[PDB]
Every structure is written in structure tokens, then in C-alpha cells.
Amino acid sequence: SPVPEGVRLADGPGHCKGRVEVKHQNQWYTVCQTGWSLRAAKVVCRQLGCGRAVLTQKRCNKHAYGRKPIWLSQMSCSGREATLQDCPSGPWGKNTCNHDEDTWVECEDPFDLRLVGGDNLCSGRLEVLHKGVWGSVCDDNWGEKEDQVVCKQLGCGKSLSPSFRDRKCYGPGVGRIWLDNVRCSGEEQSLEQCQHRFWGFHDCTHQEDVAVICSG
Amino acid sequence: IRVFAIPPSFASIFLTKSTKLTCLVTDLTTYDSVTISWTRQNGEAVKTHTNISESHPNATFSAVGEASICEDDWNSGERFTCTVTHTDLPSPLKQTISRPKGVALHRPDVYLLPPAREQLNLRESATITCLVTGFSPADVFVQWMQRGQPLSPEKYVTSAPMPEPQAPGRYFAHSILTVSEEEWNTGETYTCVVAHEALPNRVTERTVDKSTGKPTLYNVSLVMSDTAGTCY
Amino acid sequence: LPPAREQLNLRESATITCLVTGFSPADVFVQWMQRGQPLSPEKYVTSAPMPEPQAPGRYFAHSILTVSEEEWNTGETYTCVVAHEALPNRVTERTVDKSTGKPTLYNVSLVM
Amino acid sequence: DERIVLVDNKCKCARITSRIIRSSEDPNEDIVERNIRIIVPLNNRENISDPTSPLRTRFVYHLSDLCKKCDPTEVELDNQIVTATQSNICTETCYTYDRNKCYTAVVPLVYGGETKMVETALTPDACYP
Ligand SMILES: *[C@@H]1O[C@H](CO)[C@@H](O[C@@H]2O[C@H](CO)[C@@H](O)[C@H](O)[C@H]2NC(C)=O)[C@H](O)[C@H]1NC(C)=O
Numbered sequence: 001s002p003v004p005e006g007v008r009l010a011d012g013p014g015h016c017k018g019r020v021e022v023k024h025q026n027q028w029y030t031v032c033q034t035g036w037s038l039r040a041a042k043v044v045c046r047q048l049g050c051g052r053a054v055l056t057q058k059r060c061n062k063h064a065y066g067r068k069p070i071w072l073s074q075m076s077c078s079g080r081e082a083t084l085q086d087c088p089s090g091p092w093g094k095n096t097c098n099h100d101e102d103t104w105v106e107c108e109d110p111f112d113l114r115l116v117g118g119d120n121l122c123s124g125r126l127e128v129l130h131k132g133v134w135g136s137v138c139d140d141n142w143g144e145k146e147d148q149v150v151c152k153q154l155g156c157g158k159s160l161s162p163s164f165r166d167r168k169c170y171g172p173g174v175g176r177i178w179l180d181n182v183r184c185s186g187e188e189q190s191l192e193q194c195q196h197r198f199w200g201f202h203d204c205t206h207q208e209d210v211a212v213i214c215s216g
Numbered sequence: 217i218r219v220f221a222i223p224p225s226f227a228s229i230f231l232t233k234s235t236k237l238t239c240l241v242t243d244l245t246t247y248d249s250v251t252i253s254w255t256r257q258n259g260e261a262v263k264t265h266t267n268i269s270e271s272h273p274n275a276t277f278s279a280v281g282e283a284s285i286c287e288d289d290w291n292s293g294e295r296f297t298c299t300v301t302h303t304d305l306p307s308p309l310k311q312t313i314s315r316p317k318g319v320a321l322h323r324p325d326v327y328l329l330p331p332a333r334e335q336l337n338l339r340e341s342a343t344i345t346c347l348v349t350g351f352s353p354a355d356v357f358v359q360w361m362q363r364g365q366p367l368s369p370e371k372y373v374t375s376a377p378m379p380e381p382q383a384p385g386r387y388f389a390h391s392i393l394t395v396s397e398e399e400w401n402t403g404e405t406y407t408c409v410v411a412h413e414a415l416p417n418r419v420t421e422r423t424v425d426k427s428t429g430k431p432t433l434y435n436v437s438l439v440m441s442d443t444a445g446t447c448y
Numbered sequence: 449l450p451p452a453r454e455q456l457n458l459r460e461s462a463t464i465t466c467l468v469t470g471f472s473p474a475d476v477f478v479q480w481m482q483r484g485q486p487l488s489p490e491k492y493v494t495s496a497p498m499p500e501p502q503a504p505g506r507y508f509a510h511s512i513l514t515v516s517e518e519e520w521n522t523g524e525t526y527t528c529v530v531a532h533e534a535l536p537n538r539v540t541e542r543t544v545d546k547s548t549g550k551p552t553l554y555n556v557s558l559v560m
Numbered sequence: 561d562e563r564i565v566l567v568d569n570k571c572k573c574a575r576i577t578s579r580i581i582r583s584s585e586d587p588n589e590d591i592v593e594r595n596i597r598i599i600v601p602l603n604n605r606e607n608i609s610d611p612t613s614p615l616r617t618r619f620v621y622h623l624s625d626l627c628k629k630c631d632p633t634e635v636e637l638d639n640q641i642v643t644a645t646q647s648n649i650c651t652e653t654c655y656t657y658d659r660n661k662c663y664t665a666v667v668p669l670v671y672g673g674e675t676k677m678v679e680t681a682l683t684p685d686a687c688y689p
């Protein structure tokens with residue numbers, strides 16, 4: 001049986017949304033396996049690295065030009081397993097695609113962060129990308145532990161504890177306060193891996209923002 | 217011969233994300249000469265999916281036939297009908313289905329009732345109750361969870377909506393979950409997820425636990441000071 | 449089941465549940481009486497027998513009566529008389545009230 | 561370690577903890593305890609952002625509006641992820657000040673005739689500009 005070389009998610013806005021297109025040896029075709037739970041969508045999203053699977057559904061075919069043939073094996077995958085290579089597949093046989101429907105999948109935008117307002121980077125206001133928008137992080141709880149996690153992710157070195165005397169050189173923000181009550185205990189790898197309140201809910205003002213100055 | 221055609225409720229639409237139509241046929245004799253057909257309002261045919269189940273104690277056969285049409289056509293108000301032909305029946309049967317229109321939307325309330333005190337003295341089992349009420353129309357989906365993982369369906373039973381005697385146009389339903397007494401005394405947590413069309417976000421959640429219930433002790437303490445004008 | 453406290457807090461009505469299980473065969477009749485006087489059939493809604501998935505051969509049902517908040521607060525009593533052939537006297541009763549519960553305490557401390 | 565914090569309000573300085581004590585040995589005879597700790601200010605005024613407001617000598621503490629949850633949570637349904645409303649109940653008065661917050665005011669300053677309004681610090685230290 002063919003081994004998937006990759007997934008591309010064509011016919012969708014960007015490459016984190018669209019129709020599931022398994023790369024068959026040489027020419028590739030669309031797949032409509034039954035029991036398409038979110039577990040397989042999570043592995044599909046992890047193939048591209050977009051982020052977390054949010055939704056999967058099969059859409060009615062009304063002159064959608066589904067020229068791509070269909071596969072002949074199932075892909076029962078536990079979701080916590082590795083790439084599509086390491087999940088069992090049926091021994092060829094017939095297809096489970098009775099109703100002619102395309103499989104849809106909706107991944108999420110990847111995370112990103114930066115410092116704005118500081119010279120030669122490694123300093124300034126904190127902006128985090130989510131839902132395709134940048135925003136500020138509240139300073140209600142900003143311990144020294146929460147400062148070093150941001151610094152190493154951008155490779156700016158250990159923070160030098162600049163206090164608030166030089167934190168007035170960046171000013172306030174205008175964007176939405178995405179994060180609040182951030183509590184980072186361990187190093188982890190990303191700020192999103194910490195415990196926060198929620199995306200979009202806060203009790204802060206643009207005057208109270210977070211400024212992080214690393215070594216550089 | 218009896219033919220039942222159930223429409224797809226919004227509860228199925230929420231989870232399956234697919235609108236399918238089923239025409240249950242009961243008391244069938246010859247399954248080699250039957251045809252489950254689905255047609256639109258003009259006469260166009262729709263591709264069907266007929267599956268024949270196993271045998272029955274009363275020497276009858278059950279016919280299950282799925283027809284799939286996506287929600288854009290169905291929610292617009294178009295009418296469908298089911299036809300079952302049999303070589304023993306001189307005339308094919310016609311059963312039509314469609315979704316009603318013109319009903320107001322009222323937000324439902326969620327109530328969780330802890331188990332009775334006189335039940336846990338037997339050291340046998342407990343019973344938690346999830347109550348949803350005052351909602352229109354009569355469509356509701358209730359599912360229980362524990363630690364973020366769905367429970368086995370048997371552990372709980374959900375009933376159909378019933379009218380409310382004191383308020384016209386409003387209904388209610390119930391859900392019952394059974395758990396061990398030692399599990400409840402340990403301090404595990406449970407969750408009742410309720411979905412209805414009239415909710416602001418379409419999904420609501422409540423949680424019950426032994427610790428956060430009715431306390432026997434109310435150790436209230438009040439401290440007065442003339443200098444503590446701020447609290448960290 | 450005593451009525452929900454939050455339902456009373458919002459001050460519309462109260463919900464009294466009569467949960468009866470563990471009877472066989474499927475033959476049960478529940479009624480609602482207040483102060484020894486049976487209430488009208490239009491006061492409660494009666495469920496229907498249906499098998500218990502856990503233990504086969506057992507059926508169960510329930511009945512709910514809505515009461516006014518002031519009527520519930522005034523201290524009126526309610527009961528759920530049940531009838532079953534297997535019962536010794538064919539009549540069993542369970543009764544609750546507002547006072548039905550366990551006595552609480554208040555260890556108030558005032559630090560002047 | 562044996563207590564769990566439910567609410568940690570700062571405006572009303574209210575804190576509620578719950579704990580189960582294994583009294584005796586029967587599992588059905590363990591008491592559930594609820595502790596409430598309230599610190600009341602005797603010098604703060606009606607409006608904490610206006611020094612001219614009169615003094616406050618009446619405090620009301622509703623426990624139904626204190627132990628309330630108002631933040632949508634994520635729920636997995638094996639086919640999608642949805643946001644769920646915790647409570648349906650969701651202008652509150654702040655009795656005491658908050659350390660994590662800054663309180664400022666506008667005051668007229670006259671010198672040589674000209675009047676220069678300047679931002680003040682009602683709180684002693686709080687945060688810095
Ligand atoms: C308590 O004091 C505040 C501050 O004076 C009042 O809110 C201010 O109202 C003025 C106009 O009257 C605005 O210029 C300020 O922007 C307001 N402050 C804020 C933070 O927005 C508030 O109305 C007072 N409360 C009462 C009950 O009088």
C-alpha cells in the first residue's frame with residue numbers, strides 16, 4: 001500500500017485550511033475515510049506544523065469538480081501518535097467513501113512574538129501574534145521567571161534586570177491585551193505553554209504594559 | 217408494514233456536521249425486491265444508501281436507508297418525501313418530512329442536583345441529576361464528562377422533551393448519571409455539557425463536586441482596622 | 449429531591465423530583481398530595497417506564513411538581529405516595545420540607 | 561495544603577476556602593467547612609477616586625455575586641473545539657484599593673496667576689509612571 005509522502009491541504013485559504021490531499025506515490029488524490037475524528041486532523045495539522053486542529057467536516061459535492069480519485073485504505077490514528085507513517089492502515093480493499101463528500105480540516109495560525117520600540121531588538125514592548133493580530137501582554141503579574149522565558153525564545157540572552165527606570169522609553173500600546181495573569185514557572189519552550197487567563201479577557205489598560213529588556 | 221422517517225435534529229447537526237435522512241422500514245418479508253427511494257419536491261432523484269440488518273425474532277426485516285443533502289438546501293424550507301416499494305404492496309407508500317418554521321427562541325436554564333443523603337447510606341451507588349428547562353423549541357443535547365474525557369453512554373440515560381404545565385410554549389428534560397459511592401466520597405468532579413440553538417455561544421457547562429456543596433460549618437471571620445485601606 | 453436553591457434565589461418557582469427505581473415488572477403509579485389532600489392531575493407530569501441499562505430487568509420513572517416561591521416559603525408540606533404490588537402494604541411514602549436537612553452552626557468571630 | 565482557595569477578591573478583600581475533615585471513621589459523617597475572611601476599611605470614603613466624597617459606614621457582601629465564574633472555557637467534543645459559558649448570571653464597587661493598580665487624580669495648581677492642572681497619586685506609592 002502507498003505510504004503518504006505528505007499532505008498539502010489544497011483548495012483552501014492558505015495552507016492551514018482546505019481539503020485533505022494525501023500525496024500518493026507520483027500523482028496524489030483526495031481521501032474521504034469514514035470515522036474521520038479530530039485525532040487524524042491533529043496529525044494532519046502536525047504534518048504541516050500550523051498548530052492545533054479546530055474543526056473537521058464533510059461537505060456536500062455540488063459541482064465541486066472532485067477530479068482527484070479517492071484512496072482505498074483507512075487511516076485509524078490515535079492522534080497522540082507520530083506522523084501518518086506510524087498509524088495502522090487497512091490492507092487495501094474497497095473504499096468506505098459511500099457518499100461523495102470532500103474531507104475538510106481547519107488548523108490554527110502558528111504562534112509568534114517580538115519586541116517593538118527597543119533599539120537593535122532584545123528590548124521594548126511585547127507583542128504576541130494570535131488570530132492574525134498583534135497585541136500587548138498585561139503587567140499585573142510579571143515576575144523575573146516570566147522575563148527569562150521570552151528572552152531565550154528569541155535568543156537575546158539572560159535578562160539583566162533593568163527595573164522600571166528604563167522601561168519608560170517604549171510607552172504604551174494600542175492593540176488588544178491578548179494575555180493577562182501570565183504565570184510561567186518552568187523554562188518550557190514558549191509563552192503559550194504557561195498558564196494564562198484567556199485570549200481577549202483582561203482587566204488592564206494600555207498604560208500598564210509589559211517591557212522586557214534582555215542582555216542582547 | 218410500518219415505515220418511520222425521522223428528520224435530522226440540530227443535535228445531530230452539531231456533532232456529525234452532516235445532514236442525513238433515514239426511512240426506517242419495519243415488518244418486511246421480501247428484502248430481495250425492495251427499493252428505498254428519496255426524491256425532492258420537483259421529482260429529482262437523490263442517491264440512496266440501503267443497508268440490510270440481521271434477522272429478527274418475529275421473522276421480519278428492517279431496512280435502513282440514508283440520504284445525504286447538506287444543510288443549505290434543507291434549512292431553506294424545501295420539502296422531502298420517502299418512498300418504499302414492495303412486490304407484495306400494490307401501491308408504494310409515501311411519507312413526507314420537513315422542518316417547521318415560526319417558533320420563538322428562549323434560553324434554557326441548567327440545574328445540577330447532588331445525590332440524596334438517604335441513598336449513600338446503603339453503600340451501593342449514587343445518582344446525579346442534570347436538569348434543563350424552559351426552552352423552545354423542543355431540541356436538546358446533553359452529554360456527561362469526567363476529567364475532559366467522555367463517559368461511556370450507558371452510565372447515563374437522557375429522556376425526550378416534555379411540555380411544561382405552568383407555561384405554554386416551554387419544555388423541559390432531564391439526565392441521570394450513576395456512579396459508585398466510594399468514587400463520590402473520594403472527591404471526583406463531573407460535568408454536564410448542554411447544547412441548544414438559543415444559547416449565546418451554543419454550549420453551556422456546569423460542574424458538581426462533593427467539596428463545593430452544602431457545608432455543615434460556616435467559620436465566618438471579620439477583622440476591623442483603621443489603617444488597612446488597601447488589599448494586595 | 450429538595451428544590452434547587454439558585455432557582456429559588458431567582459424567585460420564580462421550585463422543582464420537586466420523585467425518583468423511584470428498582471421495581472419489576474413495569475407497573476407503577478405515583479400521586480402528589482399536600483396536607484393530606486390529593487392534588488389535581490394537572491399539577492404534575494408523569495414519566496413512563498423504561499429499562500435500566502446497568503441492571504437488566506429493572507424499570508424506573510419520576511414525577512415533577514412546580515410550586516410557587518411564596519407557597520414553598522410559607523412552610524407547606526408535600527409528599528410522593530407510590531403504589532406497587534410488590535410492596536407489603538402497597539403504599540410507601542417519602543416526605544421532605546424546607547426544614548428537611550442537617551442542623552448547621554455559625555462560628556462567627558469579630559476582631560474589633 | 562489542606563485548603564483550596566475558591567475566591568481571592570481584592571476590592572472587597574474577600575477570601576473563601578473549603579476543606580473536608582475526616583471526622584470519626586464513617587465516610588458518610590464528614591463535615592464540610594466554609595471559611596470567609598473579610599477585612600473592612602474604616603478610613604476609606606464612598607468613591608475611592610474622589611477625596612471629596614463623604615465617608616462610608618455601610619458594607620454589603622453578597623456571596624452569590626462573589627463566587628461566580630465569567631470566562632468562556634474550551635471543551636473538546638471529539639469533532640471540534642467550542643467555547644462554553646460557565647454561568648448565565650454574568651458596576652461593582654471597589655471598597656479597598658488594589659496594589660496591582662494605580663489610582664490618579666486631577667488637581668488645579670496656581671502659581672503667579674497661571675493655573676496648571678497636574679496628575680496626582682492618591683495612593684501612597686502603588687506603581688510608578
Ligand atoms: C468616582 O470618581 C470618578 C473619578 O472622578 C468618577 O469618574 C470620572 O468622571 C469624570 C467626569 O465626571 C471623568 O472625567 C473621569 O474620566 C471619570 N473617571 C474614570 C476613571 O473614568 C466616578 O463617576 C465617581 N463615581 C461616583 C459614583 O460619583
Ligand SMILES: *[C@@H]1O[C@H](CO)[C@@H](O)[C@H](O)[C@H]1NC(C)=O
Nearest residue numbers: 433434435553554555557593
Ligand atoms: C471555631 O473556630 C475554631 C478556631 O478559632 C475552630 O477550632 C473550630 O472548628 C470552629 N468551629 C467550627 C464549628 O468550625
Ligand SMILES: [Ca+2]
Nearest residue numbers: 139140208660
Ligand atoms: Ca498592573
Ligand SMILES: [Ca+2]
Nearest residue numbers: 140180181203
Ligand atoms: Ca488581571
